[PDB]
Amino acid sequence: DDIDALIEELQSNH
Amino acid sequence: RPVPEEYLQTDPSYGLTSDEVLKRRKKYGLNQMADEKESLVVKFVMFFVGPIQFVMEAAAILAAGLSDWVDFGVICGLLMLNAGVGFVQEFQAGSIVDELKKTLANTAVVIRDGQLVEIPANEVVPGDILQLEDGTVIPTDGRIVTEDCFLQIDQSAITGESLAVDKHYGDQTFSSSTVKRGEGFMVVTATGDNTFVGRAAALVNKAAGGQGHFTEVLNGIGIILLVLVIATLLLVWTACFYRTNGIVRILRYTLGITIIGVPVGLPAVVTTTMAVGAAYLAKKQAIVQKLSAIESLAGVEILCSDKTGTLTKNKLSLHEPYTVEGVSPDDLMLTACLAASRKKKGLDAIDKAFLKSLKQYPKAKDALTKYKVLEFHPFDPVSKKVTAVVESPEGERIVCVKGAPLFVLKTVEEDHPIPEDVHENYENKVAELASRGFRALGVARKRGEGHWEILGVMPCMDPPRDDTAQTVSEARHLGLRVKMLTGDAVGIAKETCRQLGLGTNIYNAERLGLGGGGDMPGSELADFVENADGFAEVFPQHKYRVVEILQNRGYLVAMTGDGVNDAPSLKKADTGIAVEGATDAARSAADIVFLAPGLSAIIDALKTSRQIFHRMYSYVVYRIALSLHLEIFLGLWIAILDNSLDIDLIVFIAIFADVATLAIAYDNAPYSPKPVKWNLPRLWGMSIILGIVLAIGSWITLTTMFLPKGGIIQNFGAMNGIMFLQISLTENWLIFITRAAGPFWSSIPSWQLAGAVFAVDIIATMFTLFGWWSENWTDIVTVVRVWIWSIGIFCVLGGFYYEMSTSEAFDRLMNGKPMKEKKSTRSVEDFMAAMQRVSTQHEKET
């Protein structure tokens, strides 16, 4: 799962 | 030819095998641009090829045989000038394309027989898998095949600016680009002379000879110039027949006239300008299939752009959510995300949008990890709701439901009667989002055995791209009107128009007509499709109709296309645009293939194309005006006074005129706002007026110098020297005039062009001072006075050019067409009112 990692990879544009 | 898809279907974990790598090396080749070294040969190639070149070298041989060293020197100087200007032009083009093809990153990482290995980028071959890490540089054209985390690349980063874009499964990654973030695997499609960058370089190299519509217009310009040259030759020969003169004198005069009357540099210079412009467009993520497109994009008047790819990010995002009183947006977002599958598999675009927008709600991000999901019912099409029973950190079971607004409202109502005010407000808001095109997701939660509580709605839609409203306003500043074509309903697209500020005046493509039906009159339908701000529910058949009717009005149309079904319209479009991700059929049927998604890239390439066109047009007008000025002045001189400039001075004038070519490619390019359409009648009127003004100034100098006491001569000087200086000054300063988009003082010329022109003027001043190839020395005082008079002529040229180029009256006079139609000042308002009425009715059709 690892939701938070998926969250950041989905918003990887900073 | 594009590689077959079979080569691209390789296993990302095992990769290709070494023997097949070798066989494809035999088939396709290395990632290496071809290098050629023929610097010595091309210099004499310019000497030989070209009919004017053979006839003029034959004339040189004849003059050498007749022991007339003078005309032999004239022809040798002209030939050396032509060879030099051609060689420097081709050298500039070669340097530009080598900068375009510069690839020094190499360092390819691939996997052979399942084993990762690092090889130089040359060894790669199309149909191969390459590993992409953070910070890596793309060696060859390819496509991203694997998706674990979305990738960000700098494909737009060829100039200093980066403008990174995102790439996912299916996106087409591009050579000479740097990876800014992300990782994955990439299947390479082309490796050399087949990638669009290499294809553009090869197109420039092939077009160094010259082919296209601009070649035809160059042929027309050259034919007319030869016509004027024959005219002034007839004038001088008639006037020198009336006065019985030696045939040597007449031939010297005709040589002097033909040195400058025909510009032998126009074809090569315009062709090189197109080549360098195609290179610059390739720098701007826009490869023209033909060089003519560079002009075709320059004069485009209407831009019909697809909504899904250009004016929107194409990503289903999240918008500001409506919430019920007493429920915070953070709690609502946490509830919505908790109703989503923890497993990555199964999440649709709505869920991805929710967990993407989770950034704005840190409380939800911190709280989601504290809930343990007990059970999960995924999206059921019948109930249209996803359910998730989770365990709170306090031990409370929480039921999370997200789905259709009406269905969620009924589900909450099925357990407890919602107050009528909340229900009415919620329904009104749902209808309001429906009118704005947001797809709405209702969210509800259940705490243990307590009642259902609904928290709000989720507006989701593809937003305008970040640089779109700015881009739309800038395009409006560029004199071209943007019409959006979308497959969605009129109501959905009206909100998109409002977001872009286009003007929210759209129509259903089918109902308005465009399909052989509809009771709207043909003229009224044409006016509607001309003045509309967009078209909703568009279809591939309607796009062709829109292009056809728009072109029937004389409007240059630029149509963007993605699918294969758009191929005919792109062919019918005056400049078919293939946006990023377009099918290979659409790219083949397009005129200019784009690389960076978004209307900003299209408008930037349009600005670059306008710059290229204005550079070429400025050079053409400047050189034709120089030819006209010298033709008129010298023809009148030998017709009336039986004299002309020294022939070597004429050669030096021609050399100075062609020297500004060596710097015209290096200057800062100002682009005209309004479209540029190769207005040949206007161009010829402009050139004739400028040449007449220069001839008038030169004749004023002649008339002044004829009087005793000097006239313009202060103590002493030379007739030929002073006239040569004045002609050089008033001629080579015209490039400062034509290069400007408007008045000559609006745009400051670059250091290269100004330096070249000033060096030419300094050399001419030294020629006049020291009397080289002239009768007598000319002192500094009359030289600076000639400089001042040439500055005055430069200023009057500025006035004439500003008042004639920017005046539509002169354009009407030259073209000969009347003052358009001058539609009644009140019927235009009634027509706009009818536009609005039909747009409202098309919205109300639903």
UniProtKB/Swiss-Prot annotation, chain B:
Keyword list, A-Z: Amyloid, ATP-binding, Cell membrane, Hydrogen ion transport, Ion transport, Isopeptide bond, Magnesium, Membrane, Metal-binding, Nucleotide-binding, Phosphoprotein, Prion, Translocase, Transmembrane, Transmembrane helix, Transport, Ubl conjugation
Listed result of changing residue 402 to Q: Activity reduced to 19%
Result, substituting residue 199 to T: Normal activity
Extracellular topological domain: 65-68, 242-253, 667-682, 774-785
Reactions listed under catalytic activity: ATP + H2O + H(+)(in) = ADP + phosphate + 2 H(+)(out)
Entry PTM: Phosphorylated on multiple Ser and Thr residues.
Transmembrane segments: 44-64, 69-88, 220-241, 254-275, 648-666, 683-702, 753-773, 786-802
Residues engaged in binding Mg(2+): 562, 566
Main location: membrane
InterPro entries: ATPase_P-typ_cation-transptr_N (IPR004014), ATPase_P-typ_cyto_dom_N (IPR023299), ATPase_P-typ_P_site (IPR018303), ATPase_P-typ_TM_dom_sf (IPR023298), ATPase_P-typ_transduc_dom_A_sf (IPR008250), HAD-like_sf (IPR036412), HAD_sf (IPR023214), P-type_ATPase_IIIA (IPR006534)
Listed SMART domains: Cation_ATPase_N (SM00831)
NCBIfam families in the record: ATPase-IIIA_H, ATPase_P-type
Protein name according to UniProt: Plasma membrane ATPase 1
Name of the coding gene: PMA1
